[PDB]
Structures are given as C-alpha cells and as structure tokens.
Write an enzyme that holds these catalytic residues in place. Structure first.
Site, PDB file in Angstrom:
ATOM      1  N   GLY A  64       0.765  -1.251   0.000  1.00 19.26           N
ATOM      2  CA  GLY A  64       0.000   0.000   0.000  1.00 19.26           C
ATOM      3  C   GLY A  64       0.793   1.297   0.000  1.00 19.26           C
ATOM      4  O   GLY A  64       0.574   2.157  -0.851  1.00 19.26           O
ATOM      5  N   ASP A 204       9.458  -5.727 -18.610  1.00 19.07           N
ATOM      6  CA  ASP A 204       9.370  -6.328 -19.951  1.00 19.07           C
ATOM      7  C   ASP A 204       8.259  -5.728 -20.791  1.00 19.07           C
ATOM      8  O   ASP A 204       8.012  -6.142 -21.935  1.00 19.07           O
ATOM      9  CB  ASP A 204       9.290  -7.863 -19.895  1.00 19.07           C
ATOM     10  CG  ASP A 204       8.057  -8.387 -19.186  1.00 19.07           C
ATOM     11  OD1 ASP A 204       7.802  -9.601 -19.305  1.00 19.07           O
ATOM     12  OD2 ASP A 204       7.324  -7.637 -18.504  1.00 19.07           O
ATOM     13  N   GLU A 257      -6.258  -2.253  -2.641  1.00 20.48           N
ATOM     14  CA  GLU A 257      -7.332  -1.244  -2.778  1.00 20.48           C
ATOM     15  C   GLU A 257      -8.393  -1.794  -3.711  1.00 20.48           C
ATOM     16  O   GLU A 257      -8.062  -2.143  -4.836  1.00 20.48           O
ATOM     17  CB  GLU A 257      -6.769   0.007  -3.443  1.00 20.48           C
ATOM     18  CG  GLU A 257      -7.637   1.223  -3.276  1.00 20.48           C
ATOM     19  CD  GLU A 257      -7.187   2.051  -2.099  1.00 20.48           C
ATOM     20  OE1 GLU A 257      -5.968   2.075  -1.838  1.00 20.48           O
ATOM     21  OE2 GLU A 257      -8.034   2.665  -1.428  1.00 20.48           O
TER      22      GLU A 257
HETATM   23 MG   LIG Z   1       5.949  -7.862 -16.943  1.00 17.42          MG
END
Ligand SMILES: [Mg+2]
Length: 287
Positions: A64, A204, A257
C-alpha cells in the site's frame, strides 16, 4: 545521496528502524523522515522531497505505501524525479520480498539510498488507479480451514468467493468461462506469499495473466499458490493490456485497494518509474 523516507502511521515506534536510520545519519547520510496520516500526504511529501533536490523517495511500509509513493512519483511532471526506494515495513511485504529487498533494515536502507536505479513498469486500471505489483480479481462480497480463509481475506480482500462467468482478451489471448481467481501481475506475489504469476518480470512491458478456474479453493489452489505446482486448470497469458468483462461485478484488489464493476481495461505503463533494486533482482529481465 540524500533521501526522503516516507513512513507510515505504523512505523513511528519501530526502534530497530529508528536505530538503523539514526546510525546511517551519523555516517554522513542525509535522510529526511516524513510520516503520513491520510491519502494525499505521500504526494505532499514526494513534492517536498523534490524541493530538497533529493535522489530517492523511500516507501517505508506495505505494498500500500509503496503504491501510494509510486503512484505519486509517476504523477510528477518534470526534470529531476526521485528514484523509488523500498523499506520492508509492512505486514506482508510481498513486492519487496519478491524484488529481493533485504530483511535487514540497515541493509535495506542502504540499498534504497545507494542502490542502482532501473526503470520498471507500472500498470493502470480503467485510465485511473495505478498499481505496481498485483491485481487480483474474483466475485464475492467485500471484507474452518485457515489456508482458504487466508486467500479469501488476505489475497482477495473479501468475505466470500465464488466462481462466475467472464471473458478476458489481450494480445494473443482470448478466453471465456467460469473463473475463481484472476491474477494480473506486474510483480509475481501478493497477499503474503501467494505466487499468482511465477513468470512475471517488472520491466518487460508485459502483464502476466493467470486465470484459476475451480469450484472452490481446494488443496489444489492452496498448493499451487504456495510453492510451485504445474497445473492444467490454470490459464496463462502475457500482454501489454487485458480487457475483462463480466455479467456480474468482479472485485479487483489492486495492491490492497478494492475496485468493482463489470468492465476492466488493465494496461502496462512502460518504464514509468526508476526503482532502486539489487543487481540480482529476480523480476528484472536478463541483460
Ligand atoms: Mg511484466
């Protein structure tokens, strides 16, 4: 270089932390400590960090706090934006564990001040909420065997969990059917050690998807989440975006959340943020 440590409400009486911070101050380091009380505060202290000309804003807290700081850093417009550092001061520390932050706080501090910084992805849901680690989705109601409760309560942040219909599309990916858990990961791990996306890399340009089909949470699902289990009842994908839709509300937990609705567009924010990470970092792609 100087840093600003954004601390939580639950850190102000951590003596080891105090000892460590204090021992690094008397080594020549400049380290500001700011304590949050409400949302918006991290943002305020991120910008104060800027004014100081600081090199790292350090999230001292759970997934968080890291998400609050990260989200605040990516919203920063301009030239001299602080790298993100991480202190593992939460209950579960999923992201920090998974990116190899040391448990030893003097070491974690030192990493966070003096580590190498590398650009990592973040992700955004419905052009609104961002997240750095994991989005888990399921169908249920918001919050005997503890393995199972741990998953519904901790990972999914719900009181109930049932499978329901949905369809999911992304690059090279198209699925429709009943799903019990949807894992959409920047990182690999959420809810205190659950391995949702074992193959995730944070830089990536790609979200991992894993869909867990089921009936209920069986030793199957508990097993497959703890250590590694190779399992045909898990559907996988990798895409810069995933669209999810469902005839009934799905509830997504985005780094702690909640968000509910019938439609979600989740999309990678490529190299959105520089984070101070160890060189061996398991979640960074090889170079
Ligand atoms: Mg990734």
């Amino acid at each position: 270089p100087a840093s600003l440590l954004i601390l939580n409400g639950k850190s102000t009486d951590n003596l080891p932390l105090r000892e460590a911070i204090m021992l690094l101050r008397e080594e020549g380091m400049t380290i500001h400590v700011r304590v949050t009380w409400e949302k918006g505060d991290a943002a305020r202290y991120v910008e104060e960090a800027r004014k100081f000309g600081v090199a790292t804003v350090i999230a001292g807290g759970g997934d968080g706090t890291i998400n609050e700081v990260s989200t605040a850093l990516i919203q920063c417009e301009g030239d001299d934006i602080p790298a993100l550092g991480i202190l593992p001061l939460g209950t579960a520390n999923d992201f920090a564990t998974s990116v190899g932050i040391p448990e030893a706080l003097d070491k974690a501090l030192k990493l966070a001040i003096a580590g190498d910084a590398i650009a990592i992805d973040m992700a955004q849901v419905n052009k609104q909420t961002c997240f750095i680690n994991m989005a888990t989705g399921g169908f249920g109601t918001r919050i005997a065997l503890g393995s199972v409760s741990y998953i519904i309560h901790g990972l999914m942040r719900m009181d109930t969990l049932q499978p329901d219909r949905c369809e999911i599309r992304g690059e090279n990916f198209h699925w429709q059917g009943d799903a019990l858990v949807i894992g959409i990961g920047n990182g690999r791990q959420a809810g205190g050690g659950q391995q949702l996306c074992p193959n995730a890399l944070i830089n990536d340009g790609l979200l991992q998807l894993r869909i867990f089909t089921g009936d209920e949470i069986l030793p199957a699902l508990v097993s497959t989440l703890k250590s590694d289990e190779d399992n045909p009842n898990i559907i996988e994908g990798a895409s810069s975006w995933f669209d999810i839709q469902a005839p009934h509300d799905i509830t997504f937990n985005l780094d702690g959340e909640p968000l509910s609705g019938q439609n979600f567009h989740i999309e990678i924010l490529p190299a959105a943020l520089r984070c101070r990470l160890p060189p061996d970092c398991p979640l960074l792609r090889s170079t």
